[PDB]
Write a structure and sequence with these properties.
mainly alpha; monomer
């Protein structure tokens, strides 16, 4: 039981941050940055 507003908020938070990491990784692929990206990708997948 989760509100769509709230579920949406969390999704937006992770997507927005995920994009930033994906955007900078393409030009500057870092392992540290990559690790953070996986967490975002995994959460979004759920």
């Amino acid at each position: 039981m989760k509100s769509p507003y709230e579920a949406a908020h969390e999704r937006a938070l992770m997507v927005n941050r995920l994009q930033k990491l994906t955007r900078m990784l393409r030009v500057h692929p870092d392992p540290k940055w990559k690790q953070e990206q996986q967490e975002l990708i995994k959460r979004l997948k759920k």
